[PDB]
Paper text:
Known broadly protective antibodies engage sites on the major virion surface protein, influenza virus hemagglutinin (HA). These include the receptor-binding site (RBS) on the “head” of an HA subunit (1–5), sites on the HA “stem”, and a recently identified site at the interface between two heads of an HA trimer. Stem and head interface antibodies realize their full protective potential through Fc-dependent pathways that lead to the killing of infected cells rather than by blocking viral entry.
In S8V2-47 the HA-220 loop, including Pro221, is pinched between HCDR2 and -3. The combined breadth of the subject 8 antibodies, without an IGκV1-39 representative, covered 10 of the 12 HA serotypes, demonstrating that polyclonality and diverse V(D)J gene usage can achieve broad reactivity.
Author numbering:
A (entry chain C): 1 to 82, 82A, 82B, 82C, 83 to 220
B (entry chain A): 52 to 87, 91 to 263
C (entry chain B): 1 to 218
Amino acid sequence: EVQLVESGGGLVQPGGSLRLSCAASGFTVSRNYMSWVRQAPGKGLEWVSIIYSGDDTYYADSVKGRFTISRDNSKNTLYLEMNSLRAEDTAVYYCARGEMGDGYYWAPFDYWGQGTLVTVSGASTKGPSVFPLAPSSKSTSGGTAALGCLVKDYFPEPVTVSWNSGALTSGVHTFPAVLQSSGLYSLSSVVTVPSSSLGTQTYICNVNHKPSNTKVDKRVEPK
Amino acid sequence: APLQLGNCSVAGWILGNPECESLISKESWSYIVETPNGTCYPGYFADYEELREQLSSVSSFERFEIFPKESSWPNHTVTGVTASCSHNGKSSFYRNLLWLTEKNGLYPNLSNSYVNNKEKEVLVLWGVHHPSNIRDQRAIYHTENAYVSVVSSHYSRRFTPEIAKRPKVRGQEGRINYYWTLLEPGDTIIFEANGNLIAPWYAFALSRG
Amino acid sequence: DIVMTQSPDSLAVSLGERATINCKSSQSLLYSSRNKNYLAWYQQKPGQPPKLLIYWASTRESGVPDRLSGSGSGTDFTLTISSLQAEDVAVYYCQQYYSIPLTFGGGTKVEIKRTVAAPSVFIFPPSDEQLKSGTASVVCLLNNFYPREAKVQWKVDNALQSGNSQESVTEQDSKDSTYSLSSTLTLSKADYEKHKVYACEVTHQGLSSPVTKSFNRG
Ligand SMILES: *[C@@H]1O[C@H](CO)[C@@H](O[C@@H]2O[C@H](CO)[C@@H](O)[C@H](O)[C@H]2NC(C)=O)[C@H](O)[C@H]1NC(C)=O
């Protein structure tokens, strides 16, 4: 019941502004603690801002004066209008809840959002190139075949790879992307299936790159 | 002949909340009629249920001046007020408490005591301010590690105000925790501090039961 | 600004063993009024948001297993896993909701020790689609191994490669405690077809000898 749907992230140039949204259902935002907590890639968690009670606002000194938090009760949404964004602001921002009882003492973050990524760079987005990692006898050690896709040359993070529109989850391993010398990202997402179902089952890796509005569906077939 | 408090609570009544100026203490009552947050300037009222039990039925109730404002406190400013305790569009404070601050940029060590000559039980109240940041701890008391010691023949406790920025209540980031005790006839209570003390201003002598 | 410090920075114990996560605060998390300690413990599995496991230092939330428990009062707090399971592989932060700024700890990465698993190696030649563009990326795969320490060396006609290959490792699977590694050898089109034999050699604890998979066209 209690979910937190976030939206508003993506790529922004240094100095630019961006507005984050958090759709809520299962509790009243005007009657609970609402907080933003960002996490730099590969770094610890960091609190950012809050809003509570009669729309009183605290902020962290690292983003104070640049960010402004707000909310809309008729829409049941949390907002974080960001201004003068810097490179160190590149983080996945999370949506947070707390049971505001008496409003005298603080509360932890019991329910969280799934996280949206904000990339502060000026290189602009470019579409990923998807290539089939076709299986063969060199990728068949025994009674199991290995196949995947190579999502190469894109910017910025992230990309979401699924197989057969999410109907294939057992054995799928999508690896973290790597930043190559050119300045673009590249990763590979593989899946281990029984080598008997190669000629009978069709396989489609599904890649989506929101910052470039790109959606690629590549079939993988044996060589 | 019970009590009628109206809007005010016992916390608001006994602390002297300026919103309760209409209420005058009568010598006795069998039981209290409340309409219960009464703490003007937010904080924790310690042993509030215990105090309402002692104040249920009293006799020979009296409200006397325990620590005079213009004498008991040399080398300390006593006119500290706050906007959370407004009184007709003007900042004020509890009518039974004094909020002690700096004077000439100095909060000297504190010492004062009261001797129960009323030949009855004297209810004595005080508070401990918990500021919201280190900067306002120095600006009001000139000491980061403050101590408050309340000692009598039947109650001895020592408080350490910790600096913490809590959620806003009455538009205030800091709290004042409220405390009380009962002083037997012939007993002496002694207050010592160097900051964050809400010393008693009036106190109540009473016959309990 | 309360400084939340955790110990250790990475914890690896066998399945069913006993794991402790210790969090020391820069200030007492207790209130003079009552007796409740405003510390919380969170879990963060890879790719997921944090998940509150313990609030009020000791109390658990609904749905959290019993093997988890939080102890401590004052400036010293502890998360403890009595019988560590497979799905417990995650990062754990302690965070104070005492005063604001609300601050978390550095994080404690918990990992499972198990039996030595040897990886299964497969190699993928670049598809004709990428070669037409003018780039050759050979991918060497390492499905499931333990431990995570693994060396991948590229050979192009028996030539040890360095400076043109890149690799990334998946975090520990929360079911069978494996990891996975892929290395992407990015070459140009002129240098791919100029050569013939390409082979990724793998050395590991579970492997008695360096294993090599190779294709020969290009
Ligand atoms: C408050 O100020 C001083 C605190 O000791 C009291 O006496 C003065 O002491 C300072 C040195 O500490 C010197 O200036 C003099 O010895 C004292 N000056 C005066 C004017 O008394 C002073 O008595 C205290 N205030 C009152 C009203 O008594």
